[PDB]
């Protein structure tokens, strides 16, 4: 896996200091020899590292929210697609939202 991540540096970034940053935490949290060996063998903790590195950029934030946010966002998106510049307002989204709920209950 470490050679695969060497390839990943080769093809994504092509800069070493970011890799230095990525490797530092491994030994930093390393406590004993057995955990060191197993963690550098499976490299499964790199999974947690790169999961929590860019976790809250675009996807997770939208994953954590209320259904009302999704409904109003859909109301805005549909009217934006209908529109020329995609412009939208508060009450336009409210109107489309109520239309959505009316259809759902109908």
């Amino acid at each position: 896996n470490l050679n695969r991540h060497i390839r990943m540096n080769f093809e994504t970034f092509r800069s070493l200091p970011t890799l230095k940053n990525s490797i530092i935490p491994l030994v930093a949290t390393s406590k004993n020899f057995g955990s060191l060996c197993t963690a550098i063998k499976s490299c499964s903790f790199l999974d947690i590292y790169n999961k929590n590195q860019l976790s809250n950029n675009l996807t997770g934030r939208l994953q954590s929210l209320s259904d009302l946010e999704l409904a109003i966002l859909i109301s805005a998106a549909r009217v934006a697609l209908r529109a020329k510049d995609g412009s939208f307002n508060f009450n336009l989204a409210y109107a489309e939202y109520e239309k959505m709920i009316k259809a759902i209950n109908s």
Binding site: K20, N21, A28, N91
Partner: protein
């Protein structure tokens, strides 16, 4: 180095990260690091929690949330550095420099160099930590700031018996991605979830609201000698369960707003709890369901104003949401005399209900005409031989309307083209209003006027 880990309930990942990052010896700590997060996660709380876990290490604290620019940070830092140095080394001699003497990072580094050279006789090297809470929350922030603060450890000489370190905290992450090329170590706190926030609250606010006065108030207002701390905690826990089950859709995974709402609405719920309500809390919740169903957290009547102020603002909402041509049919009451035809009105219905639209512009004479048309009846007549011969029973352009209209602009309810060096008098000025539908609606029934029919038919 032996570091006592803070056994936190939910932030143990970042605890491990930072405990591995930082220790007494500066050699095993990074040159620069960031601790980013989101509001409500208690990043600042956990920082001081870790400091409690590690007392020997020390750091300075600054809160630029109150400061406005760069030089105030310069003066604050220049003060705090030497203040902490002299307080934690009482025996060392000094020539205390003026913190106000700093007016630029060059001067700041010069005075720090003076401090270090006067502190040259230390026994072992020591690195301290600096904290800037809300560095992105500044009020005049620009994009040329963070890198300069990153560049403090470089211009410093390497033979400094006393060094320093930087800490940060951001919210948006947009400006963080704007600068990530420098490959800085970072630790993150994702926004919490349902059970996480529930547990956080029931272990944080539990004691705060358990030792509150209102509990003891009600316990003897009811005068029931059947209680125990276990049951108090259980009733508070289930009430918080109800609060979260009700308002999670409203906010989600935040704590600040929930705490504010709890402080506001706790007393009303406590005023309703009783013996039967504690023995069977479902009915208690049914009896206090009203605040859950409606927050209503703001504050019969709405005004103590004159009549023309109430009645003229009514006209303006009409004069910017109605077509200039589709009004002559409904806003006319005279009997025709000479030959002439009216229009057909709105042949085609509109399906957008311009309530949802940004309003239009208009000249003031339109307002004059429509207000004259809609004004209530005054100047009572008698149908006498001379009563109505000269009464002219209809309001005209007096001075009081002019003055009360001029008042409205300073009341910022009638909005004109926003202008410094405003000029109420100009042929070319357009006017408008800034009020939603509810502002105008509240006047209608209170004054017994009706205009809803003009809008309720188009869409």
């Amino acid at each position: 180095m032996n570091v006592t880990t803070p056994e936190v309930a939910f932030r143990e990942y970042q605890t491990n990260c930072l405990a591995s990052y930082i220790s007494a010896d500066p050699d095993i700590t990074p040159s620069n690091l960031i601790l980013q997060g989101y509001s409500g996660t208690g990043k600042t709380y956990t920082l001081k929690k870790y400091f409690n876990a590690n007392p020997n290490l020390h750091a300075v604290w600054l809160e630029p949330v109150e400061l406005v620019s760069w030089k105030p940070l310069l003066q604050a830092i220049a003060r705090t550095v030497q203040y902490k140095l002299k307080t934690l080394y009482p025996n060392i001699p000094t020539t205390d420099y003026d913190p106000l003497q700093v007016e630029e990072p060059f001067l700041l580094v010069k005075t720090l160099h003076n401090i270090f050279v006067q502190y040259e006789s230390l026994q072992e090297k020591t690195c301290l930590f600096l904290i800037l809470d809300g560095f992105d929350s500044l009020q005049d922030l620009d994009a040329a700031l963070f890198n300069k603060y990153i560049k403090l450890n470089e211009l410093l000489p390497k033979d400094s018996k006393i060094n320093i370190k930087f800490i940060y905290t951001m919210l948006e992450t947009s400006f963080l991605q704007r600068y990530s090329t420098h490959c800085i170590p970072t630790v993150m706190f994702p926004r919490y979830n349902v059970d996480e926030v529930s547990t956080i609250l029931v272990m944080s606010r539990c004691g705060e609201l358990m030792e509150d006065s209102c509990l003891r108030k009600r316990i003897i207002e009811e005068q029931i000698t059947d209680c125990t701390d276990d049951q108090f905690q259980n009733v508070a826990a289930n009430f918080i369960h109800l609060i979260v089950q009700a308002f999670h859709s409203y906010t989600g995974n935040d704590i600040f707003a929930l705490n504010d709402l709890i402080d506001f609405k706790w007393p009303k719920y406590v005023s309703r709890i009783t013996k039967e309500n504690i023995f069977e809390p479902l009915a208690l919740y049914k009896s206090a369901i009203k605040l859950f169903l409606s927050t209503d957290d703001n504050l019969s009547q709405t005004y103590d104003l004159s009549i023309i102020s109430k009645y003229l603002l009514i006209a303006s909402y009409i004069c910017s949401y109605l077509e200039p041509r589709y009004d002559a049919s409904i806003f006319s009451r005279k009997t025709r005399i000479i030959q002439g035809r009216a229009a057909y009105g709105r042949r085609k219905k509109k399906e957008v209900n311009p309530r949802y639209l940004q309003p239009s512009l208009f000249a003031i004479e339109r307002l004059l005409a429509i207000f004259q048309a809609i004004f209530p009846i005054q100047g009572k007549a008698e149908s006498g031989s001379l009563s109505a011969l000269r009464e002219e029973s209809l309001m005209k352009a007096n001075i009081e309307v002019f003055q009360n209209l001029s008042e409205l602009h300073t009341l910022k309810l009638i909005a004109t083209t926003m202008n410094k060096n405003i000029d109420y008098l100009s042929p070319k000025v357009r006017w408008k209003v800034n009020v939603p539908w509810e502002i105008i609606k509240e006047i209608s029934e209170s004054v017994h006027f009706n205009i809803s029919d003009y809008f309720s038919d188009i869409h």
